[PDB]
Design a protein around this ligand. Structure first.
Ligand SMILES: *[C@@H]1O[C@H](CO)[C@@H](O[C@@H]2O[C@H](CO)[C@@H](O)[C@H](O)[C@H]2NC(C)=O)[C@H](O)[C@H]1NC(C)=O
Ligand SMILES: *[C@@H]1O[C@H](CO)[C@@H](O[C@@H]2O[C@H](CO)[C@@H](O)[C@H](O)[C@H]2NC(C)=O)[C@H](O)[C@H]1NC(C)=O
Ligand SMILES: *[C@@H]1O[C@H](CO)[C@@H](O[C@@H]2O[C@H](CO)[C@@H](O)[C@H](O)[C@H]2NC(C)=O)[C@H](O)[C@H]1NC(C)=O
Ligand SMILES: *[C@@H]1O[C@H](CO)[C@@H](O[C@@H]2O[C@H](CO)[C@@H](O)[C@H](O)[C@H]2NC(C)=O)[C@H](O)[C@H]1NC(C)=O
Ligand SMILES: *[C@@H]1O[C@H](CO)[C@@H](O[C@@H]2O[C@H](CO)[C@@H](O)[C@H](O)[C@H]2NC(C)=O)[C@H](O)[C@H]1NC(C)=O
Ligand SMILES: *[C@@H]1O[C@H](CO)[C@@H](O[C@@H]2O[C@H](CO)[C@@H](O)[C@H](O)[C@H]2NC(C)=O)[C@H](O)[C@H]1NC(C)=O
Lengths: 583, 583, 583
């Protein structure tokens, strides 16, 4: 009787199913959450008189219908068009070469080009109908507003590392962007993968290749699967023979089956409309004093700085520099960002060994952390590489039968070294990784592991006749703070010929290691690594109540009242009586 | 008149049958339970106006329809795609190489590749319709909330080993994950199994193999079973002759029969939609102070640590390291995880014998446990391998005719040894296993059993002329705490050439044994071993009432009131009057 | 019961969907916002009796239908007709050569001509129906009026750099123009791309080329896709062979499919009408004392000067001077504006290095900005090029447990130099750009970066044997204030042979740099750079209340009352009593 169903009973019209305002993940092109609030109170319609739209939504009739007769050749996977999220992946940002490179449509296309030495062609029937946009005066959703107040409460009780944790659960549920405009329509695409040596002789007749690819697309749709085709004349005999893959997907409308008139596909697009393009803005753009009137001024500029840090950390991880030229050696298959590390010679290095010590600062009673946090050399110059503090909580139970239990914490800082007539290297495996020497979390035969950063193992053998089959050279560790001195004989990268691999993200700082195997390189493409990148804190910090919030340079002060009402602006006679009881 | 039927009478629409929120087992890809609460109060619909959805559910119209013309070749069973649970099996976890490897679809595919030396190809018509997701603000179900309170009660009456038992009945009923997003659709798949020597000569024309496999798939669907096919031209004469198996399964829609137009299959998908992909989060992620407001803070971080231990124990069991290379010898067929134990030489070892002693600490009266818990040598260096305590309860009946009965417990710790001119080895069989030397729970001819770990038998014969037909060599016992010293002449694995096998899980710790038979290896694939991995306790621990719960480091205290009301936060004037009567 | 639905129930007529009054972006031909208010109170109709129009709207029946039998040849992309926004892109302005050159239809056409050496021909069926215009007496919208009052409030509290920021969020949401008249209709266009050497021999028979192009267009529409064509006689055998691309788009009406009678397309245009031409006026034209009666006179002439500056800044950026002649060398592909920089010789220049110093004026406590704002020479005459001040805010927390937090600001002015036996040049990459030497944000091998303008890196190597593969020459920096002295051996442009590229827009002033690579030139076309071009201010300026507003030269004064009522005109007896308490 309220909301949609009140409008839907009076009008008896469908609701437009393609709406802006939701969140958007831009590494993996998926949408998530609902940032903006959508209400159906005035019973608005599209001025066709055909759909029902919310109140803060205006549509623009496009009624456009493209129809292409030539496929387009896109040879490299580095410059990637998306066909559904092209306007939002190509924004001007620092990470424009990482957007969209963890999606379903991209990971298939990179696989089919590398494993077959192939080039791809697509041809398309696109058919845009509306453009749906949001008004500039707009209200946040009920569930998204409550999660911004919780980050503000943790920042005003001096609880960092809990506000940081709640900011990374905001990226996980709402993405990195907000879509401000979509495009309702229905596409129909065919992608083929031709052998790359079929293009190189037909450099003059490249226009004859793509003319037959768009010719075969309209035989596939118009003719039923039995061969009544009109394309097999001259070069639709090697086009069929140099191709390595073919698929046809429809995105809106009715489902596609071979042999359906393009007349009949285009008459089922009504009431089956999806978003075939979209654009938007980053997520921290919508955190400003205009959208949040209840909080003070400089407090929402501190929440918006926390969310901006969590988004940029999510792009800093899931970024793999390496070599990208396919015909060159040292080709890294997991790398999504070029480095210039191609055509670079190598030089062998000898590492003496790794060792690890612990400190055991506070928790001397009832918990002994400083036995597994220590690792000594099985057999140069060591480097420190990390200063990491490990905290653990335990439980007493004082009984008196009534009892009580108290929870302490136990700190133990550890230090992990490596030496710059030497131990061999057999790979690494962690609690989120495997060793690709064995395709399993095990060192090979003869090798023995030893812990280095409290979560991963270091496959090492001291021999020179039996473990020489799995021995791969080593290039050096570095971190987010200290680069290795092996490059520039500093910078944070591998030397030439080597490739880096992530290992052991530890509280907003990952360390890396350089190898030269060729076996760590290949395999399947890695998935995206989702936030939170930190385990939850133990609530060890005490809450410090803040009552008055001020800034010095325009003489504005916000006084929180009793009862936790709200934040009102401080009149200059009440803050005069509130600072004496404070100071 | 309430719930679904109120909405269903007014709207007269079907309910969408593919919903998130339920649990999910990730070793065996099955779903179980219902973790989240789903209510039908606002009578929401999908904005098509076609289905009825719950209140805390938003759908995303995809309306996509893939159609592939080439089969895909996947040669090894180690890297396994699932076609229905691919997004959730490939999560970043420690056990990513164990997910999905106890399901129906996997165990068939591993069988057909090993027993035939075959490779598999699949081709597919996929047709995704909606994407159904859950809101981030969400309530737990009524039945799942009551089972989390019962684990908290056992932890606050100092009843460990009963809270551990109730946590493993939570994994049995609700799985290891919670699905947060599903994909409603309908697939149509054909899998074939070609001989592996048919690929190796057609390395150049591998693109001609897969083009005919996708050609035969559309003759099978479009043509009725009588041969009107258009594929038998050149190489659809050995493709039919090198294949070893073929099946066609449909997953949604109407049932498949040979000869049905793809037009007609795609018009029955409405109202017959199933989940063709899903993704989710682990089960202990949803146990936090946000979801459970009634319990104290550090108490639900102790329940969530108990459930995380029970899930990781369920992946630690059902994990079989071994050799995986098929053409290599020492191939273990039951192994689902590689080890590097391939291409390893063997060395014979002589074991003197096993013997077992008991202690009989407490139950000296009316129960004699220390006669069957003892086993002496029928005929080096012994090792202890286990310190296990065995508890049994009995019953007095004091009569006075009125009577009364009291229940005691009887403890008897046992120790089980083995010796590091020697007894022969004929296999083992237990109360959950058989001896594969006989395919039965019996020692072979000449062999006599003797107990070792109070539940299994040790087939042993002292002869050298008659029991030499069933004698297999022996590689050594180890446990979850002590590895054997026979490897690295320590580590917890077999030496080279040998294979390990589970035996006698005893209270969260299994022991293993290394053999070299080739007969223990083969057979059928083992099923998953389901929790609980411990028999129920005898309630021997006394309940210790806890009233006040505090943590030291933010000065918060929770005071339980009388009557077992609930846990309220302790004001600093009531805990002042509650600690004096306590301490 | 009000608005549209009251008129729509009584009349039972559709609403005309093509209306003026909305905003319009003129670089990218898209429409956005709604500047004018549209009300449906009198229930007016089009005097056909066919549509429903708003009250302040008059339509003109055209009922015209063009039909062309010859394609038109447009060879160069510099003079670009738009076919949907031709009347509004060709206005008399300073930036008439930049209008429409960031749209979807233009960027495709520039790509297909450069990459193929092609010329384009279009043929069209146009069919104009109405002309819809706005009355001269007209009211602003509710949402656009509220955003003009907010710019006026920031200008009367002496808050510049916040009123400048709110003016650039007005261009982002409402564009650069307002459409005052549209044209409802439905076009049907075919564009082809012929090889440019096919025109040059048929200079006499250019009329035979375009006669067959309009002949093939009516075989495509009238005949179904099977070849029943009547065009293949003499020169529809090389016209089919010299063409490189072909598409057919419809803009209004029903969707196009090959084989539909032109009879049948022209009977579906009713109720499917879109804007096929439009014209309008700039956005600051509609900010005058007539439209805003509440504000004073000289105050709305100050708001309208602020918005005019933000629009002209948006055209000053997104303007790329360079070479445009395609067959000439030094061809810049990203350039949209000619320069005369073609056919110009080059001269090598040696730059010693770049260095950077900081000042740290105010924020000496708790924040050290003057360590990363400094960069020293790794190894002439330096020039200053910029004087930029960097402000950052921090947070104290004075505790007393009650606490309070104060927000300061920290200023640190920096200076960035470059020298007019020399460092090599390897490219630049920034926080909104990449290095095109690597197609990634990385310096090549041997090169090391060093910061220059607090956001970008300068790829530099001091060697002469290894980094000679990626070394490109350098032409000099300049800015919006200082041109380089290398041209005219001043002007703000490159010397001959070089090309400029944008880098580091910093608060309404960009700096540029001249290179000569040929690799920085190519690639994909850049998207439009959208406002705001400045990060939000930190509210450091104090609000200065203004009460009376006067101008000297007609003796008019506006007195703001109490309560923030409004601005009334000052009677000469109240301002007499208001200036004494003021002065
Ligand atoms: C507010 O939180 C910060 C962050 O932890 C506290 O700063 C640290 O406090 C510890 C405790 O003495 C010191 O050992 C560290 O050196 C401090 N680090 C920094 C960067 O200041 C701070 O003390 C807290 N303030 C209050 C009043 O609790
Ligand atoms: C893949 O493409 C190449 C073209 O580069 C094909 O090679 C030609 O095939 C035709 C077929 O009759 C021959 O007449 C030519 O002599 C071949 N060579 C050249 C240089 O054109 C090749 O056949 C294609 N692959 C398959 C399997 O057909
Ligand atoms: C709470 O339960 C624990 C777990 O059993 C008890 O700890 C054991 O108690 C027995 C009985 O004296 C001792 O022999 C063990 O050595 C204890 N083990 C550990 C690890 O502490 C504990 O005593 C119980 N507390 C109360 C008050 O009943
Ligand atoms: C299994 O595949 C092999 C191909 O590796 C088939 O062997 C070929 O069969 C054709 C059939 O006429 C012969 O002409 C070839 O000479 C055979 N050998 C090779 C190397 O191509 C084999 O026939 C297939 N199995 C069955 C049962 O047909
Ligand atoms: C009104 O705003 C202007 C703009 O900032 C102020 O002018 C500057 O004020 C600072 C502060 O003393 C001076 O250092 C600058 O030299 C001034 N610049 C110019 C161009 O005047 C102005 O002072 C403000 N007026 C009031 C009353 O606050
Ligand atoms: C592209 O256009 C040129 C015309 O400039 C074509 O060249 C002529 O092709 C015809 C076809 O039989 C020949 O008779 C002429 O001798 C060719 N030359 C001239 C100067 O007219 C060329 O063939 C076209 N391209 C394609 C692929 O057909």
């Amino acid at each position: 009787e309220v909301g949609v169903q009140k409008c839907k009973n009076a009008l008896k019209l469908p609701v437009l199913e393609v709406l802006p305002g939701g969140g958007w993940d831009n590494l993996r092109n998926v949408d998530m959450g609902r940032v903006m609030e959508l209400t159906y109170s005035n019973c608005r319609t599209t001025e066709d008189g055909q759909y029902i739209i919310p109140d803060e939504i205006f549509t623009i009739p496009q009624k456009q219908s493209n129809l292409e007769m030539n496929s387009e050749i896109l040879e490299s996977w580095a410059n990637y068009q998306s066909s559904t999220s092209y306007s939002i992946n190509t924004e001007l940002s620092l990470f424009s070469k990482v957007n969209g490179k963890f999606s379903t449509e991209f990971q298939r296309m990179k696989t089919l080009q590398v494993k077959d030495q192939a080039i791809t062609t697509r041809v398309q029937v696109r058919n845009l109908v509306y453009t749906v946009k949001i008004n500039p005066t707009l209200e946040l959703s009920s569930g998204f507003r409550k999660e911004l107040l919780d980050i503000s409460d943790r920042l005003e009780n001096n609880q960092t590392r809990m506000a940081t944790y709640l900011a990374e659960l905001l990226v996980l549920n709402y993405g990195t962007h907000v879509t401000t405009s979509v495009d309702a329509g229905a596409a129909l695409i065919q992608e083929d993968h031709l052998r790359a040596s079929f293009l190189q002789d037909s450099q003059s007749s490249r226009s004859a290749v793509t003319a037959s690819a768009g010719l075969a697309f309209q035989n596939t749709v118009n003719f039923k699967f039995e061969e009544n085709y009109t394309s097999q004349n001259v070069l639709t005999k090697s086009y069929l023979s140099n191709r390595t893959n073919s698929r046809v997907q429809s995105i809106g409308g009715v489902p596609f089956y071979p042999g359906i008139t393009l007349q009949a596909w285009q008459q089922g697009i009504t009431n089956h409309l999806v978003a075939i393009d979209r654009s938007g803005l980053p997520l921290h753009f919508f955190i400003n004093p205009n959208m949040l009137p209840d909080l003070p001024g400089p407090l929402v500029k501190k929440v918006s700085k926390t969310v901006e840090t969590a988004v940029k950390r999510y792009y800093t991880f899931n970024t793999y520099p390496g070599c990208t030229d396919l015909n060159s050696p040292n080709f890294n298959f997991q790398a999504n960002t070029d480095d210039g590390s191609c055509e670079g010679k190598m030089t062998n290095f000898s590492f003496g060994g790794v060792y690890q010590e612990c400190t055991q600062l506070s928790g001397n009673r009832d918990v002994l952390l400083c036995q597994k946090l220590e690792q000594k050399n099985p057999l140069y110059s060591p480097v420190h590489l990390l200063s990491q503090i490990h905290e653990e909580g335990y439980n007493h139970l004082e009984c008196h039968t009534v009892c009580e239990d108290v929870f302490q914490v136990a700190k133990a800082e550890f230090r992990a070294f490596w030496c710059v007539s030497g131990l061999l290297f057999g790979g690494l495996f962690s609690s989120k990784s495997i060793n690709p020497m064995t395709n399993a979390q095990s060192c090979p035969a003869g090798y023995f592991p030893l812990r280095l950063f409290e979560n991963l193992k270091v496959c090492v053998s001291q021999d020179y006749e039996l473990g020489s089959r799995f021995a791969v050279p080593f290039g050096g560790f570095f971190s987010c703070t200290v680069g290795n001195p092996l490059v520039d004989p500093s910078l944070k990268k591998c030397p030439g010929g080597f490739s880096q691999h992530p290992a052991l993200i530890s509280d907003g700082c990952q360390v890396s290691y350089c190898v030269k195997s060729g076996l760590f390189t290949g395999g399947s493409l890695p998935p995206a690594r989702l936030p939170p990148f930190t385990r939850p804190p133990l609530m060890s910090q005490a809450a410090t109540n803040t009552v008055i919030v001020t800034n010095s340079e325009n003489a504005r002060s916000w006084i929180k009242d009793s009862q936790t009402h709200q934040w009102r602006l401080g009149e200059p006679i009440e803050l005069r009586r509130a600072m004496n009881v404070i100071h």
